[PDB]
Write a protein that holds these residues in place. Structure first.
Motif, PDB file in Angstrom:
ATOM      1  N   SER A   1      53.802  15.701 114.857  1.00  0.00           N
ATOM      2  CA  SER A   1      55.120  15.102 114.867  1.00  0.00           C
ATOM      3  C   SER A   1      55.073  13.752 115.561  1.00  0.00           C
ATOM      4  N   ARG A   2      55.924  12.841 115.095  1.00  0.00           N
ATOM      5  CA  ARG A   2      56.188  11.610 115.821  1.00  0.00           C
ATOM      6  C   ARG A   2      56.720  11.954 117.212  1.00  0.00           C
ATOM      7  N   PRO A   3      56.286  11.237 118.256  1.00  0.00           N
ATOM      8  CA  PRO A   3      56.706  11.589 119.618  1.00  0.00           C
ATOM      9  C   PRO A   3      58.205  11.454 119.820  1.00  0.00           C
ATOM     10  N   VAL A   4      58.846  12.593 120.043  1.00  0.00           N
ATOM     11  CA  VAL A   4      60.237  12.649 120.462  1.00  0.00           C
ATOM     12  C   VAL A   4      60.234  12.355 121.950  1.00  0.00           C
ATOM     13  N   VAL A   5      60.548  11.127 122.310  1.00  0.00           N
ATOM     14  CA  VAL A   5      60.388  10.674 123.681  1.00  0.00           C
ATOM     15  C   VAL A   5      61.749  10.660 124.357  1.00  0.00           C
ATOM     16  N   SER A   6      62.009  11.665 125.188  1.00  0.00           N
ATOM     17  CA  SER A   6      63.346  11.836 125.735  1.00  0.00           C
ATOM     18  C   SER A   6      63.265  12.659 127.007  1.00  0.00           C
ATOM     19  N   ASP A   7      64.275  12.497 127.872  1.00  0.00           N
ATOM     20  CA  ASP A   7      64.456  13.260 129.114  1.00  0.00           C
ATOM     21  C   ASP A   7      63.276  13.103 130.067  1.00  0.00           C
ATOM     22  N   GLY A   8      62.685  11.911 130.115  1.00  0.00           N
ATOM     23  CA  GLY A   8      61.474  11.710 130.885  1.00  0.00           C
ATOM     24  C   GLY A   8      60.235  12.315 130.273  1.00  0.00           C
ATOM     25  N   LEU A   9      60.336  12.856 129.070  1.00  0.00           N
ATOM     26  CA  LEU A   9      59.258  13.596 128.454  1.00  0.00           C
ATOM     27  C   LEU A   9      58.877  12.862 127.183  1.00  0.00           C
ATOM     28  N   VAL A  10      57.590  12.798 126.909  1.00  0.00           N
ATOM     29  CA  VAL A  10      57.118  12.406 125.593  1.00  0.00           C
ATOM     30  C   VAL A  10      56.788  13.697 124.863  1.00  0.00           C
TER      31      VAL A  10
ATOM     32  N   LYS B   1      43.689   9.218 117.172  1.00  0.00           N
ATOM     33  CA  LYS B   1      42.709   9.513 118.207  1.00  0.00           C
ATOM     34  C   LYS B   1      43.289  10.370 119.320  1.00  0.00           C
ATOM     35  N   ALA B   2      44.390  11.081 119.039  1.00  0.00           N
ATOM     36  CA  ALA B   2      45.186  11.888 119.953  1.00  0.00           C
ATOM     37  C   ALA B   2      45.695  11.053 121.116  1.00  0.00           C
ATOM     38  N   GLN B   3      45.829   9.751 120.906  1.00  0.00           N
ATOM     39  CA  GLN B   3      46.330   8.836 121.909  1.00  0.00           C
ATOM     40  C   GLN B   3      47.778   8.519 121.598  1.00  0.00           C
ATOM     41  N   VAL B   4      48.635   8.692 122.591  1.00  0.00           N
ATOM     42  CA  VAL B   4      50.033   8.314 122.485  1.00  0.00           C
ATOM     43  C   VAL B   4      50.227   7.119 123.400  1.00  0.00           C
ATOM     44  N   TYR B   5      50.895   6.094 122.891  1.00  0.00           N
ATOM     45  CA  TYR B   5      51.000   4.828 123.585  1.00  0.00           C
ATOM     46  C   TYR B   5      52.419   4.623 124.076  1.00  0.00           C
ATOM     47  N   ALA B   6      52.649   3.431 124.599  1.00  0.00           N
ATOM     48  CA  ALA B   6      53.976   2.966 124.937  1.00  0.00           C
ATOM     49  C   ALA B   6      53.959   1.463 124.804  1.00  0.00           C
ATOM     50  N   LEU B   7      54.255   0.967 123.622  1.00  0.00           N
ATOM     51  CA  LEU B   7      54.036  -0.440 123.363  1.00  0.00           C
ATOM     52  C   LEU B   7      55.242  -1.224 123.842  1.00  0.00           C
TER      53      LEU B   7
ATOM     54  N   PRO C   1      40.415   1.128 113.465  1.00  0.00           N
ATOM     55  CA  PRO C   1      41.840   0.809 113.350  1.00  0.00           C
ATOM     56  C   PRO C   1      42.667   1.722 114.244  1.00  0.00           C
ATOM     57  N   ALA C   2      43.945   1.353 114.408  1.00  0.00           N
ATOM     58  CA  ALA C   2      44.815   2.083 115.330  1.00  0.00           C
ATOM     59  C   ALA C   2      45.027   3.521 114.895  1.00  0.00           C
ATOM     60  N   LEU C   3      45.230   3.738 113.587  1.00  0.00           N
ATOM     61  CA  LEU C   3      45.279   5.055 112.960  1.00  0.00           C
ATOM     62  C   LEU C   3      46.345   5.932 113.587  1.00  0.00           C
ATOM     63  N   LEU C   4      47.601   5.635 113.306  1.00  0.00           N
ATOM     64  CA  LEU C   4      48.669   6.251 114.069  1.00  0.00           C
ATOM     65  C   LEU C   4      49.066   7.601 113.493  1.00  0.00           C
ATOM     66  N   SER C   5      48.875   8.647 114.294  1.00  0.00           N
ATOM     67  CA  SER C   5      49.356   9.978 113.950  1.00  0.00           C
ATOM     68  C   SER C   5      50.847  10.108 114.149  1.00  0.00           C
ATOM     69  N   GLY C   6      51.322   9.949 115.375  1.00  0.00           N
ATOM     70  CA  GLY C   6      52.745   9.876 115.592  1.00  0.00           C
ATOM     71  C   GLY C   6      53.281   8.563 115.077  1.00  0.00           C
ATOM     72  N   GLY C   7      54.555   8.530 114.743  1.00  0.00           N
ATOM     73  CA  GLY C   7      55.153   7.302 114.287  1.00  0.00           C
ATOM     74  C   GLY C   7      55.704   6.474 115.422  1.00  0.00           C
TER      75      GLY C   7
ATOM     76  N   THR D   1      48.383   7.357 126.881  1.00  0.00           N
ATOM     77  CA  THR D   1      47.902   8.653 127.330  1.00  0.00           C
ATOM     78  C   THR D   1      47.378   9.435 126.137  1.00  0.00           C
ATOM     79  N   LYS D   2      46.163   9.954 126.280  1.00  0.00           N
ATOM     80  CA  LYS D   2      45.598  10.877 125.311  1.00  0.00           C
ATOM     81  C   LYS D   2      46.309  12.223 125.399  1.00  0.00           C
ATOM     82  N   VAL D   3      46.688  12.782 124.246  1.00  0.00           N
ATOM     83  CA  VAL D   3      47.403  14.053 124.212  1.00  0.00           C
ATOM     84  C   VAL D   3      46.533  15.120 123.561  1.00  0.00           C
TER      85      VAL D   3
END
Lengths: 371, 59, 783, 218, 87
Positions: free
Chosen positions: A132-141, A107-113, A87-93, A124-126
Motif C-alpha cells: 500500500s501507498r504509505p498512509v501517513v497520519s497521526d504521527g505514524l507512517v 527497496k522497502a525504503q519509505v522516504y519523506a521528500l 532507479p528509485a522504483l517506488l512501491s508506495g505512492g 526509513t527502510k520498512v
C-alpha cells in the motif's frame, strides 16, 4: 506473416463513447515513464497547488497545479549498496503530508521528500516493499507492506512506532489493504480475504473478520485487485475480501452489518448511500449502503480496464488502462463525456484536488483533466 | 499380392520348452551334503489332463 | 409396508442384485419410510446411478434409476499447449475417465481443478468447461472446451533484505530470465515455480560458498498481479555475514583411513566459508570409503560456525560400512544377448570388497558398449551381513542393423546395384559384422568385415576383413581402367591400458590393372614404379601384389558407445609395407572427435572432427595413387559432391583408348578433347588435412520420446588435400596442388533421424568456398 | 472398434475372427464386446478368448493384462488354471526369441527374466491346479526350464572360471548346487568349483566335489 | 609370456591381520560374525568353515593369494583359524 502465431481469449472493450459534456485536459505536464505499464503502486498525490509528480526512475517533480510548471524537481534514483545506481522504483505512492512527500520505494525504503525541494527529509527502510501507498497520519507512517506488515513510523523522522503483520496471504496476493486509522484504530482490510482493525496507538488487533476467500483451495479471481482499504462510515467498516466480495461490518468488533458477498468488487466508493463501484467485469454499478442493492449500473466499461470511480465536474469520472477517460453519469451509467487524453493508460485513482483533477498516466505521464 | 503370407507372418518363434530336458539327479556322498534344491525349483509332477506341447487343451 | 417386488428401472452397467444388495431393502425385507429414502441414497452410493427415484406401489417398491456409468468418451478442445492426458490425469485425479461413472455434480469441480492445474502451470488465463454429451443406454461423451488466453511470465524479482549480492548477477545465476531483445536477441522467459525452488538454492549456495553461513531467506512473496500474468517477486532474505572455515574436527568410524580422510579434509583454516565443497568433501570420503569397501559410509559434518570471530569449525561424524560388501552381482535387461557379454564389461569381482568406481567404469565400459539404450544398475543390499550387496545391473539394450544404398541403376536398366549391411552384436553375441559390395557392369565388388571382439577374454578383437573387387569401369569389358582387386585383413585388438589400446594388421592386396587412363601423376606413380607405358593408349596393364603391415592405436574416453555426447577419444591408425610387397610405401593417418558441452546439460556440445593422412613411398618408391586422399560431398565434408577435395590430374595427349568410345569417356583421346585434357575430379594427394566442426542443437518441436534419439547439428565443412610430390611443371597451366591453400569451404546442418534400423543421416549442406575442380550437391543424405 | 451392437453379434464376430485367424480382428470384436459389455456372460470366456487371441496376435503383456483381468474379474474360477498356465506361457514366450534357431543357436544363457516368471506360473498352475487341463505341458516346460535357468546359471559359472574370480566361480556353482538337483550343467559346473577350490587351496573341499563327481559319474 | 603388460586380476573376501586378532579359536561363529561378519564363502558340505581368501595377479609377474578359512565346530565355536598363504 503473423496469421499463424494467434492464440488469445477475448477482453471486452469500451462501448458507449458519449460526450454529452465536452471533456478536455486542464493541462499536460508529463514526468517521463511514471506509474508505468509495469504494475506499480506508485501514485501521485495532489496538494499545495503543487503537482507533486514522480516516477519510479527517480525524478521527483513538483509541477504547478494550475498549468503543470516546475515548482521543484529532484531526481532521486538509488545509488548503491549491493548494486550501484538503481532507479528509485517506488512501491508506495506519493504521500504529501506536511513538509514531506512520503513515498515507499521497492527497496522497502519509505522516504519523506521535503515538499519545498523533494529532498529526503527522512528515509526509513520498512518491513518489505510497500504493497500500500504509505498512509501517513497521526504521527505514524502506516504502510501495508508486501508481507502485510503494518508499519508506523514517526513521520517527522521515520522513527518506527511499530511494525505488525496484518492479514497475511500465501504470497504477494495483490491487494492494497491501505491502513486507514478510524476512531483510534488502524482499520485494515486484507489480501488474505479477512478484514481487521488494528490499534492506531500501537498496532494492537482490535479484531479480525474473515470476509471471503483468497487464493488457495478456493481459487478466486485475479482481476479483483481489491480495495481492501477500509472506508469506515463511522460505525460501519466498508471493505473487501481478497476476492472482492463486499461487506459492511462493525468498527469496534467487525460484526457484519451487511454484505455484497457475491459482488466481487474491484474498486469502490461509498458515495453517500449510493455506493459507486467497479464491478468484476470492470463495469460500473451504484449500490445501496444497506444490502448493496443496485441503485444503478453501467456495462459501458465492461472489462475495459478501469481506474477507480470519482465525481469530478459533477459526473462520475473514471479512466481506463487504455488512455480513455469516462464521465459516467452519476445517474444510470451514461457517458457524459469521454476524453482519450492518453493512450498509455491509467490506473491512478483520479485526484480531484487543488480544484483540478490530476493523474499520472502510465508512461504518457502526468495529465490534469477537466471538462 | 504374391502367395507367401500376402502381408503377414512366418515370423520367428520357439517351441523347445515342451520337450522337457532330461535331468540326471546329482548324487552327493556321505559328508558332501548340501541342500541341493532351493529357490522356486518345485515342480509337482502332475500329468493331469491335456498333453505335451500343443496337444495340451487349448481354448 | 412389506415389499412384494422392488422394481429396478435401468441399471446398464451394474447387476440387478448388486443394486438390490446395495439397497437397504431387499425384495421381501421389512420396509421403512426411511429405508425407501435410504434406498435413494444407497443406490446413489452405488456411484453409477445418476438419478434414483425409489417409489413404491403401496408397498411394492418401484425404483426409477437414471445412470452415471460408462463415460463413453472424454473429448478435449482448446488444449493448444497442454496434453489432454494431463487434463485426463486431472480427470483421473478426480477419479473420472472414459468408461466410468459420470457424476454430473463434479463438472465445474474439475473445471476448477483444470484451471487450478492451469494455475499450477504458470497460467491462469485458461478456462475449461466440461460438456456432458450422452451416448446409448447410460453412456456419455465428455467434451472439454479450453479457452486458453495467456500464461504468466517472468517479470520482476525484488529481494529486499538482500544487502550483499547484486540481484542482476543473481538473476543471471537463476533461470528467472526476462529479456529477449529485438536487435540483441538472446535467451528466453516464461516462469515456472518449479524453477523457483532450484533458483532459491541458487541464491542460497551462492551465499553459502562465499562465507555467508548466517545467510538465510526470511520469506518470498510472488505477485498475484491481475491480468493473470504479472509475476513480481518480493524475496525477503537475511544475507548474513561471511565466515571462515577455520578447521575440520573430523572423526568417528574413520576405519583406519584417517590420514586419507585427512587428505580429504586438507583445508585452509580461515578461508571464506564454503559449505558446498564441505558437502563435496563429505562425499569424497564416501567414495573413498566406497573405494575402501564401505557402501554406507555415514558422513555427518557439523559446521561449528563461530560467529565470535566470524569463523566456522567443522566437526565431521564418520561411520563406514564393512569392507566386503560386493557379495555378488545381478544383470538385468539382457533377454537377447549372453550374460557374460555384459559381465566382461565390468571391473568389480564377486566375493570381494567394494570398489565404488569399479561398478562405474564397468558401467562406463557398458556406456562405451554401444548396443545399449540405458546404463544403470540396482546395487541391491542383501539384508543380513554387511558384506551382502548384490548389484543388479539392470540396463536397457538396443537394436542394430543398417543397410546402405546409393541412387539408382537397377530395375529399369540392367541388373546392377549397390549394397552395404551391418550386423553388429550378431544375434546377441557381440559379433560385429559389416558387409558391403557392389556388382555393376563397371565393377563387381564384395567386402566383409567381421569381428569377434573378445576372441580371448582380454578382448582379443578378431576383426577379419576381406575384399574382392572385379572392377572394370568398362567401355565394353575393358577399355578404360579395368582393375580386379582382392585381398584380406585380419586385425586384432590389444589391451594396452583401460583406455589405451593398440592396433596391428597385415595387408594382402592384389590389384590386377588393365587399359589405364593417361593421367600424368597416376602414371608418374607408374614411372616411380619403373613402369613406363603407352601414354596415348589405354591398353596398359599392371599386376601388383602389395604386402603391407597395418597398425594403429586408440585412446577412448567417450561416454556413450552409441549416442556419444561428452568425452574425448583418440584414433591413431596407419600402415607400412614389407619386404615382399610389389611397392614399398606407407600411409599414416589420424582422425579426431572432441565433445565439449557448451550447455552442460549437453543440448549444446562442441563437436570438432578432423581427419589426417599422409602416405608416400618408403624411399625410392611412391605411395600408389589408389591410396590418395579424398573429401567433399555426402560425407564429413558435404555440400560438395563425392571425391571433390584434392589434386586434379591431367590426361596425357591421347589417341584411341583401345576402344575409346565414340565421343564418350574422353581422356584427351582420339574422340575429341585431344592433347593433354585435364580431369577435374579429386585425384587426391600424398597428404590429407580435412576437418568438420559441428554443434549439438536440440529439437523443440519433436517429442523427446524420440527427439532424444535425434541429433541436429549445424556445421561448417572445410578442408584441403594436396600432394607434396605434385610439381607445377606439367601442372603449370594446369592447377598445382602442392599447397596447403587448397582449402574448400562448406556449411549446413545434418539430420540424424533414428529409424528402427539405425540413425539415418540427411544434410542439406552448402559449399561456401570451392577450390579447384569442386562439384556440388546441396542436399546430401548418408543412408 | 465395434459399436454398441447386439453383444452376440459382437461375440460371434469375435469368435469368427478367432476362427479366421484374424487375431488383430479377433481382439477388435472381443474387446469391443467387453468395451460395451464387460458385464457380459461370455465376457469371462471372452477374457480367455482374449488371452487366446492376444497370444495368437503375440500380445503377451496384453495377454498378461487379460490374464490379470481374468485374475481380477474372476478371482476364483476353474479357468484360472489357463490364466496360471498362459501367464507362464506368456512368460515362457516373453523371455527369449531370435532368428538364430535355424542356425542352431540357443538363448538359454540369455537372461531368464520371464523364464523366471514362467517357472513361477507354470508351477503355480501345477501347484494351484495340478489336475487341470494344463498341468501336463506346463510340467514339461518346468522340467525344461529348470535346466534353462541352470544353463543360464552355468554360463556365469562358466564365465568366472576364465575370469578367474574363483570366489565368484564357486558361488555361481553353489547357486547351481543349492538349486538344481538334476541338471547336467550343475554336474559339469561340479569340477569348476572343485578347480576354483584347488585354485583357492580348498583341494580338500574340492576332493569333496571329486567324490560328488565320483557320485555324479553316474 | 613375452608380454609384460597384464590387466590386473583381483579378488577380495579375505581377512586382514586385524581381522584375525578380532577373533580366536573358541569364539563362536557369531562371535566371529560380530567381528568379521559372514564370509562370501562358507562350507556347505561339512562343518562351519568360514573361507576368506584373497586372490590377485597384477602384471605378468605372478599371482598373490591370502586364504583365511575359519573352521569352527558343528556348534559354530571356532576350532581353526586356517590362514593359507599364496602358492
Amino acid at each position: 506473416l503473423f496469421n499463424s502465431e494467434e492464440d488469445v481469449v477475448k477482453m471486452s472493450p469500451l462501448p458507449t463513447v458519449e460526450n454529452q459534456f465536452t471533456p478536455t485536459t486542464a493541462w499536460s505536464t508529463s514526468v517521463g515513464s511514471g506509474i508505468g505499464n509495469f504494475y506499480s503502486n506508485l501514485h501521485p498525490a495532489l496538494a499545495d497547488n503543487v503537482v507533486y509528480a514522480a516516477d519510479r526512475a527517480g525524478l521527483v517533480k513538483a509541477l504547478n497545479a494550475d498549468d503543470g510548471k516546475e515548482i521543484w524537481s529532484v531526481s532521486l534514483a538509488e545509488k548503491d549498496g549491493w548494486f550501484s545506481k538503481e532507479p528509485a522504483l517506488l512501491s508506495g505512492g506519493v504521500t504529501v503530508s506536511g513538509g514531506h512527500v512520503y513515498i515507499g520505494s521497492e527497496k522497502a525504503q519509505v522516504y519523506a521528500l521535503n515538499t519545498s525541494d523533494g529532498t529526503v527529509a527522512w528515509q526509513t527502510k520498512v518491513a518489505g516493499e510497500a504493497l500500500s501507498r504509505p498512509v501517513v497520519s497521526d504521527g505514524l507512517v502506516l504502510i501495508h507492506t508486501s508481507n502485510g506488515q503494518l508499519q508506523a513510523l514517526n513521520e517527522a523522522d521515520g522513527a518506527v512506532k511499530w511494525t505488525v503483520n496484518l492479514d497475511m496471504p500465501s504470497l504477494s496476493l495483490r491487494g492494497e489493504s491501505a491502513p486507514t486509522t478510524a476512531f483510534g484504530a488502524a482499520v485494515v482490510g486484507g489480501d488474505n480475504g479477512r478484514v481487521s482493525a488494528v490499534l492506531m496507538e500501537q498496532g494492537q488487533m482490535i479484531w479480525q473478520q474473515r470476509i471471503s476467500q483468497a487464493t488457495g483451495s478456493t481459487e478466486i479471481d485475479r482481476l479483483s485487485d481489491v480495495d481492501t482499504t477500509p472506508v469506515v462510515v463511522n460505525g460501519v467498516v466498508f471493505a473487501l475480501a481478497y476476492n472482492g466480495n463486499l461487506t459492511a461490518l462493525d468498527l469496534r468488533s467487525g460484526q457484519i452489518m451487511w454484505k455484497r458477498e457475491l459482488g466481487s468488487v474491484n474498486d469502490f466508493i461509498v458515495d453517500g448511500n449510493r455506493i459507486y463501484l467497479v464491478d468484476q467485469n470492470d463495469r460500473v454499478m451504484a449500490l445501496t449502503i444497506d444490502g448493496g442493492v443496485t441503485l444503478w449500473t453501467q456495462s459501458d466499461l465492461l472489462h475495459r480496464l478501469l481506474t477507480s470511480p470519482v465525481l469530478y465536474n459533477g459526473n462520475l469520472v473514471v479512466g481506463d488502462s487504455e488512455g480513455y477517460l469516462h464521465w459516467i453519469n452519476v445517474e444510470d451509467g451514461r457517458f457524459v463525456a469521454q476524453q482519450k487524453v492518453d493512450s498509455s493508460g491509467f490506473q491512478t485513482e483520479p485526484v480531484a484536488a487543488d480544484g483540478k483533477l490530476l493523474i499520472q498516466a502510465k508512461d504518457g505521464t502526468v495529465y490534469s483533466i477537466t471538462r | 499380392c504374391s502367395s507367401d503370407s500376402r502381408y503377414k507372418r512366418q515370423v520367428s518363434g520357439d517351441e523347445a520348452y515342451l520337450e522337457a530336458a532330461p535331468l540326471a539327479e546329482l548324487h552327493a556322498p556321505a559328508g558332501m551334503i548340501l541342500p541341493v534344491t532351493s529357490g522356486d525349483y518345485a515342480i509337482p509332477v502332475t500329468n493331469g489332463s491335456g498333453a505335451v506341447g500343443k496337444a495340451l487343451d487349448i481354448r | 409396508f412389506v415389499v412384494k417386488d422392488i422394481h429396478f428401472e435401468g441399471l446398464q452397467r451394474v447387476a440387478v442384485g448388486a443394486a438390490l444388495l446395495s439397497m437397504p431393502v431387499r425384495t421381501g425385507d421389512t420396509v421403512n419410510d426411511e429405508d425407501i429414502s435410504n434406498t435413494i441414497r444407497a443406490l446413489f452410493a452405488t456411484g453409477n446411478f445418476e438419478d434414483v427415484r425409489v417409489l413404491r406401489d403401496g408397498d411394492t417398491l418401484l425404483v426409477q434409476v437414471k445412470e452415471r456409468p460408462t463415460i463413453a468418451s472424454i473429448t478435449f478442445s482448446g488444449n493448444k499447449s497442454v496434453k489432454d492426458d494431463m487434463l485426463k490425469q486431472n480427470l483421473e485425479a478426480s477419479g473420472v475417465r472414459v468408461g466410468e461413472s459420470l457424476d454430473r455434480t463434479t463438472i465445474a469441480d474439475i473445471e476448477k481443478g483444470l484451471e487450478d492445474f492451469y494455475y499450477s502451470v504458470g497460467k491462469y488465463s485458461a478456462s475449461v468447461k466440461a460438456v456432458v454429451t450422452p451416448l446409448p443406454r447410460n453412456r456419455v461423451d465428455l467434451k472439454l472446451v479450453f479457452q486458453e488466453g495467456v500464461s504468466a511470465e517472468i517479470q520482476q524479482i525484488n529481494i529486499v533484505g538482500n544487502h550483499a549480492f547484486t540481484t542482476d548477477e543473481l538473476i543471471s545465476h537463476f533461470q528467472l530470465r526476462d529479456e529477449v531483445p529485438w536487435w540483441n536477441v538472446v535467451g528466453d522467459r516464461k516462469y515456472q515455480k518449479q524453477k523457483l525452488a532450484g533458483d532459491l538454492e541458487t541464491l542460497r549456495s551462492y551465499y553459502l560458498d562465499r562465507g555467508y553461513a548466517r545467510f538465510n531467506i526470511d520469506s518470498t512473496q510472488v505477485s498475484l498481479t491481475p491480468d493473470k500474468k504479472g509475476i513480481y517477486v518480493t524475496v525477503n532474505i537475511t544475507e548474513g555475514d561471511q565466515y571462515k572455515l577455520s578447521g575440520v574436527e573430523v572423526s568417528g568410524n574413520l576405519a583406519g583411513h584417517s590420514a586419507e580422510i585427512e587428505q580429504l579434509t586438507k583445508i585452509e583454516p580461515g578461508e571464506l566459508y564454503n559449505g558446498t565443497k564441505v558437502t563435496k568433501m563429505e562425499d569424497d570420503i564416501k567414495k573413498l570409503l566406497g573405494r575402501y569397501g564401505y557402501a554406507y559410509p555415514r558422513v555427518q559434518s557439523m559446521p561449528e560456525i563461530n560467529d565470535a570471530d566470524k569463523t566456522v569449525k567443522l566437526r565431521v561424524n564418520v561411520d563406514a560400512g564393512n569392507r566386503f560388501y560386493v557379495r555378488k552381482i545381478r544383470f538385468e535387461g539382457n533377454d537377447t544377448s549372453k550374460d557374460a557379454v555384459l559381465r566382461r564389461e565390468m571391473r568389480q569381482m564377486e566375493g570381494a570388497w567394494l570398489g565404488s568406481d569399479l561398478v562405474d567404469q564397468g558401467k562406463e565400459r557398458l556406456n562405451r558398449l554401444g548396443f545399449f539404450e540405458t546404463v544403470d544398475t540396482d546395487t541391491q543390499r542383501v539384508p543380513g551381513s554387511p558384506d551382502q550387496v548384490d548389484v543388479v545391473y539392470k540396463v536397457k539394450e538396443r537394436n542394430t542393423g543398417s543397410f546402405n544404398f546409393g541412387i539408382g541403376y537397377g530395375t529399369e536398366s540392367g541388373v546392377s546395384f549397390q549394397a552395404g549391411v551391418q550386423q553388429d552384436n550378431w544375434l546377441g553375441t557381440g559379433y560385429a559384422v559389416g558387409i558391403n559390395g557392389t556388382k555393376n557392369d563397371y565393377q563387381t565388388y564384395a567386402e566383409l568385415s567381421v569381428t569377434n571382439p573378445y576372441f580371448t577374454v582380454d578382448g582379443v578383437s578378431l576383426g577379419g576383413r576381406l575384399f574382392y573387387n572385379d572392377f572394370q569401369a568398362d567401355d565394353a569389358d575393358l577399355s578404360d581402367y579395368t582393375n580386379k582387386s582382392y585381398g584380406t585383413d585380419v586385425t586384432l585388438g590389444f589391451p594396452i591400458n583401460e583406455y589405451n589400446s593398440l592396433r596391428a594388421g597385415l595387408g594382402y592386396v592384389h590389384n590386377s590393372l588393365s587399359n589405364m587412363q593417361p593421367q600424368v601423376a597416376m602414371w608418374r606413380y607408374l614411372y616411380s614404379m619403373g613402369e613406363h607405358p603407352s601414354t596415348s593408349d589405354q591398353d596398359n596393364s599392371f599386376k601388383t601384389d602389395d604386402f603391407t603391415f597395418n597398425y594403429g592405436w586408440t585412446y577412448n574416453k567417450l561416454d556413450r558407445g552409441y549416442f556419444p555426447t561428452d568425452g574425448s577419444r583418440v584414433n591413431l591408425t596407419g600402415k607400412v609395407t614389407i619386404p615382399g610387397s610389389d611397392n614399398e610405401y606407407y600411409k599414416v593417418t589420424l582422425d579426431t572427435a572432441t565433445y565439449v558441452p557448451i550447455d552442460d546439460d549437453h543440448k549444446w556440445v562442441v563437436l570438432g572432427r578432423t581427419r589426417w593422412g599422409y602416405g608416400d613411398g618408403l624411399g625410392g618408391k611412391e605411395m600408389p595413387f589408389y591410396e590418395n586422399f579424398y573429401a567433399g560431398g555426402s560425407s564429413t565434408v558435404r555440400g560438395f559432391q563425392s571425391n571433390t577435395i584434392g589434386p586434379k590430374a591431367v590426361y596425357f595427349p591421347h589417341q584411341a583408348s583401345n576402344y575409346d568410345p565414340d565421343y564418350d569417356y574422353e581422356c584427351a583421346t582420339q574422340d575429341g578433347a585431344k592433347d593433354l585434357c585435364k580431369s577435374d575430379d579429386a585425384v587426391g594427394g600424398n597428404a590429407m588435412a580435412v576437418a568438420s566442426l559441428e554443434f549439438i542443437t536440440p529439437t523443440p518441436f519433436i517429442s523427446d520420446k524420440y527427439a532424444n534419439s535425434v541429433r541436429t547439428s549445424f556445421f561448417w565443412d572445410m578442408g584441403t588435400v594436396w600432394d607434396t610430390n605434385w610439381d607445377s611443371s606439367q601442372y603449370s597451366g594446369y592447377p598445382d596442388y602442392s599447397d596447403p591453400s587448397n582449402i574448400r569451404m562448406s556449411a549446413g546442418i545434418a539430420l540424424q533421424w533414428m529409424s528402427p534400423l539405425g540413425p539415418l543421416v540427411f544434410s542439406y549442406a552448402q559449399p561456401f568456398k570451392k577450390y579447384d575442380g569442386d562439384k556440388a550437391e546441396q542436399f546430401q543424405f548418408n543412408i | 472398434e465395434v459399436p454398441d451392437n447386439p453383444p452376440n453379434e459382437i461375440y460371434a464376430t469375435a469368435q469368427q475372427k478367432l476362427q479366421d485367424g484374424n487375431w488383430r480382428q479377433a481382439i477388435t470384436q472381443l474387446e469391443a464386446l467387453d468395451n460395451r459389455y464387460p458385464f457380459g456372460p461370455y465376457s469371462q470366456q471372452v477374457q480367455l478368448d482374449l488371452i487366446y487371441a492376444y497370444y495368437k496376435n503375440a500380445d503377451l503383456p496384453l495377454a498378461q493384462a487379460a490374464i490379470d483381468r481374468f485374475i481380477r474379474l474372476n478371482p476364483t474360477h476353474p479357468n484360472i488354471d489357463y490364466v496360471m498356465y498362459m501367464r507362464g506361457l506368456t512368460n515362457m514366450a516373453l523371455d527369449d526369441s531370435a532368428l538364430q534357431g535355424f542356425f542352431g543357436v540357443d538363448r538359454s544363457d540369455r537372461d531368464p527374466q520371464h523364464a523366471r516368471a514362467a517357472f513361477s506360473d507354470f508351477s503355480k498352475l501345477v501347484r494351484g491346479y495340478p489336475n487341470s487341463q494344463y498341468t501336463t505341458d506346463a510340467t514339461k516346460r518346468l522340467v525344461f526350464l529348470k535346466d534353462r535357468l541352470a544353463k543360464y546359471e552355468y554360463s556365469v559359472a562358466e564365465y568366472y572360471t576364465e575370469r578367474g574370480a574363483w570366489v565368484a566361480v564357486v558361488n555361481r556353482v553353489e547357486g547351481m548346487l543349492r538349486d538344481y538337483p538334476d541338471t547336467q550343467a550343475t554336474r559339469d559346473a561340479l569340477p569348476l568349483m572343485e578347480n576354483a577350490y584347488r585354485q583357492m587351496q580348498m583341494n580338500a573341499q574340492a576332493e569333496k566335489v571329486a567324490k560328488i563327481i565320483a557320485a555324479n559319474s553316474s | 609370456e613375452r608380454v609384460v603388460y597384464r590387466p590386473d586380476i583381483n579378488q577380495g573376501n579375505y581377512l586382514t591381520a586385524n581381522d584375525v586378532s578380532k577373533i580366536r579359536v573358541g569364539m563362536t561363529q557369531q562371535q566371529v560374525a560380530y567381528a568379521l561378519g559372514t564370509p562370501l564363502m562358507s562350507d556347505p558340505f561339512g562343518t562351519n568353515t568360514w573361507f576368506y581368501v584373497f586372490r590377485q595377479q597384477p602384471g605378468h609377474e605372478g599371482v598373490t593369494q591370502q586364504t583365511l578359512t575359519l573352521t569352527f565346530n558343528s556348534s559354530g565355536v571356532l576350532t581353526n583359524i586356517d590362514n593359507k598363504p599364496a602358492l
